[PDB]
Design a protein around this ligand. Structure first.
Ligand SMILES: O=Nc1c(NC[C@H](O)[C@H](O)[C@H](O)CO)[nH]c(=O)[nH]c1=O
Ligand SMILES: O=Nc1c(NC[C@H](O)[C@H](O)[C@H](O)CO)[nH]c(=O)[nH]c1=O
Ligand SMILES: O=Nc1c(NC[C@H](O)[C@H](O)[C@H](O)CO)[nH]c(=O)[nH]c1=O
Ligand SMILES: O=Nc1c(NC[C@H](O)[C@H](O)[C@H](O)CO)[nH]c(=O)[nH]c1=O
Ligand SMILES: O=Nc1c(NC[C@H](O)[C@H](O)[C@H](O)CO)[nH]c(=O)[nH]c1=O
Ligand SMILES: O=Nc1c(NC[C@H](O)[C@H](O)[C@H](O)CO)[nH]c(=O)[nH]c1=O
Ligand SMILES: O=Nc1c(NC[C@H](O)[C@H](O)[C@H](O)CO)[nH]c(=O)[nH]c1=O
Ligand SMILES: O=Nc1c(NC[C@H](O)[C@H](O)[C@H](O)CO)[nH]c(=O)[nH]c1=O
Ligand SMILES: O=Nc1c(NC[C@H](O)[C@H](O)[C@H](O)CO)[nH]c(=O)[nH]c1=O
Ligand SMILES: O=Nc1c(NC[C@H](O)[C@H](O)[C@H](O)CO)[nH]c(=O)[nH]c1=O
Ligand SMILES: [Cl-]
Ligand SMILES: [Cl-]
Ligand SMILES: [Cl-]
Ligand SMILES: [Cl-]
Ligand SMILES: [Cl-]
Ligand SMILES: [Cl-]
Ligand SMILES: [Cl-]
Ligand SMILES: [Cl-]
Ligand SMILES: [Cl-]
Ligand SMILES: [Cl-]
Ligand SMILES: [Cl-]
Ligand SMILES: [Cl-]
Ligand SMILES: [Cl-]
Ligand SMILES: [Cl-]
Ligand SMILES: [Cl-]
Ligand SMILES: [Cl-]
Ligand SMILES: [Cl-]
Ligand SMILES: [Cl-]
Ligand SMILES: [Cl-]
Ligand SMILES: [Cl-]
Ligand SMILES: [Cl-]
Ligand SMILES: [Cl-]
Ligand SMILES: [Cl-]
Ligand SMILES: [Cl-]
Ligand SMILES: [Cl-]
Ligand SMILES: [Cl-]
Ligand SMILES: [Cl-]
Ligand SMILES: [Cl-]
Ligand SMILES: [Cl-]
Ligand SMILES: [Cl-]
Ligand SMILES: [Cl-]
Ligand SMILES: [Cl-]
Ligand SMILES: [Cl-]
Ligand SMILES: [Cl-]
Ligand SMILES: [Cl-]
Ligand SMILES: [Cl-]
Lengths: 152, 153, 154, 153, 153, 153, 153, 154, 152, 153
């Protein structure tokens, strides 16, 4: 059985990307954004075609991402930030709701939203993953933007 | 090097209209949160004539109250205050989960940012230690996100 | 000094119409909750001719019953009663989670406040210790939130 | 004392139309549930010519099947049967959670009561001990909630 | 009691199937896809009626499956991939959200979506389940496509 | 192939001296265990005049009583009976852990085998289902290990 | 089968009891001690044969009980106090170590030690159990002192 | 560069005397473990005339049996076999913890190495997947540690 | 019923106290020791009668405390330090074993050992508790030293 | 101000004799630990002619080996190296707990300090990240505690 397999497309030329960065544990999101923007340029995304906004924390990602997607000016969005466990169930609540809103936005608007929100126990874990997750989200935004076009 | 447009955060509260719903379970906690919240709003330049404060019995009632205030579209941003403090039963998880989920749902479905200032902690001492800080935080979240929602409309 | 408008809570039940859905699983518990609830509503000034009480097998059936009562808009506020008591399986988590989630959803989507009086406890004794208190609590939540919904309605 | 109107439960199945979706994973369990369920329905007065039974591979497929049967509005109430038995992985939580959540969502959005008869247990023995009881329970739930939904319309 | 029992139908002739393969832990999804396609052919599905696309990870399944389903080019969909626990709560988040989106799409569009995303602690667990889960999802997609047809007015 | 000496288990109770300490917390359970235990001992050939039965308030008191009976060396093997049923607190873990650990320590330090028949369950129903079986099991364990300890001396 | 059954003996006349009361959450241990002493008197224990000492917390019970037991001035000992969960794993550590030491002392010295240390999540749980646990420990100390005598050559 | 004395592992079983205690709960598992164990010992050069095998009802009885065999000092090393498979209760934790603790204690207090081949798993399939491997592993542990105890004995 | 109740005695005059401080998360044990020594002086303990030693981490407390107790030069010992959860089960192992050894030493030698080893999830929790636990352990060492005398 | 005698840590390894037992399960990990450990010992001044290194199959075998080396009293301090990496079963807890407990018991009962360098981690990546550091740490622990044991003898 040899069906049609759509080959992934990582060509960023012409894409419009939005990025919302939660600033809680700011050093983490900044490292993610530096890696993220850098990778987007590598993929061919124009610097003039990227908007970056920031919010206080991960629970504010939903409302900001929702607007940018509902504008339909963007082929794909990226959510950045870090939830680091402290002393309370607040970690579970934030991790759960921020990810759930990122899922909901992509389903209801058709705009892919790369989920680059870390959910980790320690500062060191977030530092170890920051740059990697940032560049990954750049590749997710580009690829899924192109995949959404093929399916419209 | 990549130099895109970065929208600078705007913490100017002049002219903003804020609604606040305070869950009263563990009342000393929410009262401290509201005292810190109102004070910080003033520091940010929000007029006291432009702030409405209502209260509900507990965190599970935040959803229905916040839903009305948002759907009226009289408010640029909302704030939820309160404290879920673990006792002896899975009720702690249920309340923490559902109140936070409704705060999330309201912001997404109406476009009105809702700062989530409901604590979810194991002990009274944890709630006391975080009350004032979380109140002031919610002041800066409401103001900042109110401006961001306008800038993206 | 910042002094905003503070809407004062209103616990006057005169004229309110309240619906109550009582899950019958662990029936002794819900019956005790309902006895405390009705008594407190009367104390708050709710007319007994303005209270409707229905019952369902268990907490997972509360969603559909409450959903109908709210969508009729005959009620100013609703109350959910019952008890999920942990046994031997993850069924406890499932029931606790889903019944509370439906109570939340109904209030959000219809604007009708729904007091959540469904206990989620490990033992019969915990449910007995909490039954009457939670019942009266739900009475005060229904009255207060019914009035708050009025104050915020166009 | 306070004496309001108490709607007494009605377990008369005469004339009701019932749909049943049986998940077949751990087939011995769902089959045993269905035997108890159909028997109880008959005892309650439900006509066999007014009952439809379909089956799906597992509990995660219950949502889509139940969604159609409810949206057809040929049925006064539906019943979901099956068993999620913990193995070695978080897959147990995933299936338990989603199947139950979908059963909830269908009942809320269509008004058709859906009895949740999907067991969520750690061992085969737990499922066997609960099969027949849960089947008959779901029969009584479908009838009662079908009549209650009628009384509120 | 002998009611109407709709018999399962595993005839894939004429069915149109979409497959979204998450590539995180790529060896797993590849083994799932080989097993899946092989089983579909065994059931009589034409290769000219199957589309396969891939996404980086399980959190991208939602948006991809959503478009394919809303196009109504497909009688049923299949999600493949593997979430393997590492060091952080990210495992729970991904397992939870990917499964919830697969559930949501099937409910809101009526298109069955076979959930073939593994949620396991170790690579060895994923390797042991890969092929089996791929073929299972083939049988689920075919069966549910036929069940959806039987229930479409 | 490799064929070593395999000591075959010996379940002949003739002539053995058995001690039994019955914890009385959740008395219905331990009483039911003891009825099954004494019966099985008789079936195995143990003389009733060679069995001693004592009882203590709860599982945490088993250690000191069993310690004396073993240190007297009047008994070839001992049996501990009782039931720890989870309630509302970490007390369940504490009792389960210490009673079992003491049963282990006594057998190691004195050489007298101690059958552990203390259930550690979440619910009364679990204890009831396991009572008789665990009683007879402990009877077979006492006899077998008594004979094995003799064979090694 | 009718074996020799040593009947429990709750006659406290002539028994010598030592009591070590941990003072952390002092209200709890005080209520336990009032209930405990009252019950001992009811059982016939002379007040001139009871010694009560106190330590700061449950981790100091071990060394105090150890000395009193090794003196062999006491027929049985009683440990009172309460570990109430706060914000950290310290709760498990204290509950675990205090109970393990109470177990170890009784095994190594032969002196029964009633474990009356509560291990609970909340102050309310400790208050609800305090008096009951105090009286229970009285009955355990008396009964086990008599049982130890019956088993002493 | 630091080069100390490294004692090389010694897997020669010639002349060793091995004892094996097999818990029979979930009997198919322990039987499979023992088949793999005996086979590997033979491969390592252990004489079958120098191996003793006894069995106990369950893992909680391993302590007392192993204790006697070690205290006799007829054995250079011992092996514990069996499987604790989680069911419905905390009994799984208790048995897993106590059987391993006794295996540790016996080796520490007597100097006789005791290979721990008691599985502690959630499902029958996990135990089947691990049975033979763990059996052969325990054979190599018994031989190797028997020789290491000799190299460190006065 | 009015039995003999031994009244607690917090008079430190003449007592000999040993202190073993685990240095992992050093700032914590130092704050504990500053509060601890200060309280001992308040209770009447001679500065010339206190020995303070330190070990790398909490798992080394057992062997050091064991020697000092087996010398029988000390009326009571104090263990200080902090186990702060990171990313692994190492937290449970260290918390469990360090506390278990502190219990074992006191039982087998008769020398009370105040357990001042924190077992917490975050640096902030340890900072909040350091001084309190230090002074508490001083009062535990004094009181239990005096209690051991009455029972010899 | 209180100025007592503070014994200064002594990290001078000249003349010390160290034994090392390396568990070989996940061999790459223990090998890296030993490479870092030996190097740091040299930095501290320990003669290579005064170090013995042996290896065992896994962490559960560390106890019996370490016990001999300590009881010979040829060594001023010991070091245990290895890695317990969680897989699919409660075996991870058992091994982590028992090996650490034996390392503790040996040091207490023989007086020979034993640095515990056995990792207990969820993933291979965690073990790799900590190997070299933990090896060097154990070098400084062995040296420092060897000197402390002498100073207190
Ligand atoms: O608390 N920890 C975190 C956090 N809290 C703030 C939260 O997102 C929100 O801003 C407030 O609740 C106000 O709405 N936000 C994060 O992004 N990461 C964390 O680790
Ligand atoms: O119970 N604990 C809490 C709580 N329970 C009440 C609940 O929110 C609701 O008011 C009732 O169930 C009635 O609907 N509400 C809180 O805000 N914090 C708590 O800590
Ligand atoms: O099982 N325990 C409980 C329970 N089970 C039944 C469930 O709510 C429902 O009736 C069935 O799933 C049928 O749909 N219902 C409760 O209210 N409390 C419990 O403690
Ligand atoms: O795995 N265990 C179970 C299960 N898995 C299959 C799942 O429901 C679904 O059919 C597949 O993911 C395909 O979409 N389904 C059950 O009903 N019970 C179980 O115990
Ligand atoms: O990290 N582990 C996994 C994972 N992470 C990536 C995630 O799904 C998503 O693609 C990114 O967050 C970008 O949005 N995705 C998986 O499918 N399986 C895993 O095991
Ligand atoms: O509490 N639950 C239980 C229990 N508590 C009492 C305990 O064993 C002891 O008797 C007291 O602490 C007095 O020393 N004892 C049991 O055998 N089973 C239980 O389920
Ligand atoms: O912290 N909580 C508790 C506690 N801490 C003190 C501890 O027992 C000990 O006295 C000190 O660590 C000094 O050695 N002691 C208790 O009896 N109950 C608690 O609930
Ligand atoms: O129950 N499960 C198991 C078990 N129970 C019996 C126990 O070891 C002992 O025989 C009795 O307590 C009698 O003393 N024994 C095992 O080896 N594996 C199990 O999985
Ligand atoms: O790792 N975390 C901690 C820790 N690790 C080191 C350990 O005590 C010991 O020194 C080594 O295992 C070497 O023997 N020690 C602490 O006192 N607190 C911690 O939080
Ligand atoms: O299984 N995982 C591990 C392990 N198992 C083997 C065990 O220590 C012992 O050798 C056998 O049970 C035989 O006695 N040993 C380790 O050092 N690390 C692991 O991660
Ligand atoms: Cl790619
Ligand atoms: Cl926090
Ligand atoms: Cl990484
Ligand atoms: Cl800012
Ligand atoms: Cl509570
Ligand atoms: Cl809304
Ligand atoms: Cl939206
Ligand atoms: Cl803080
Ligand atoms: Cl009020
Ligand atoms: Cl159950
Ligand atoms: Cl209460
Ligand atoms: Cl009925
Ligand atoms: Cl599984
Ligand atoms: Cl929704
Ligand atoms: Cl609805
Ligand atoms: Cl049952
Ligand atoms: Cl089939
Ligand atoms: Cl729907
Ligand atoms: Cl047999
Ligand atoms: Cl309890
Ligand atoms: Cl011991
Ligand atoms: Cl021994
Ligand atoms: Cl059973
Ligand atoms: Cl009695
Ligand atoms: Cl003993
Ligand atoms: Cl080898
Ligand atoms: Cl079980
Ligand atoms: Cl394997
Ligand atoms: Cl005091
Ligand atoms: Cl760590
Ligand atoms: Cl504090
Ligand atoms: Cl140093
Ligand atoms: Cl494993
Ligand atoms: Cl030893
Ligand atoms: Cl010692
Ligand atoms: Cl690190």
């Amino acid at each position: 059985m040899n069906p049609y397999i759509l080959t992934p497309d990582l060509n960023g030329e012409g894409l419009h990307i939005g990025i919302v960065r939660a600033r809680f544990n700011e050093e983490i999101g900044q490292a993610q954004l530096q890696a993220c923007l850098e990778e987007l340029g590598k993929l061919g995304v124009d610097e003039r075609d990227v908007m970056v906004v920031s919010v206080p924390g991960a629970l504010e990602l939903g409302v900001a991402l929702a607007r940018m997607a509902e504008s339909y000016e963007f082929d794909a969005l990226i959510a950045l930030g870090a939830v680091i466990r402290g002393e309370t169930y607040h970690f579970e609540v934030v991790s759960n709701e921020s990810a759930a809103a990122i899922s909901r936005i992509a389903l209801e608007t058709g705009i892919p939203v790369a989920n680059g929100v870390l959910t980790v126990d320690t500062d060191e874990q977030a530092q170890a993953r920051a740059a990697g997750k940032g560049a990954d989200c750049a590749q997710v935004a580009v690829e899924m933007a192109n995949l959404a076009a093929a399916l419209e």
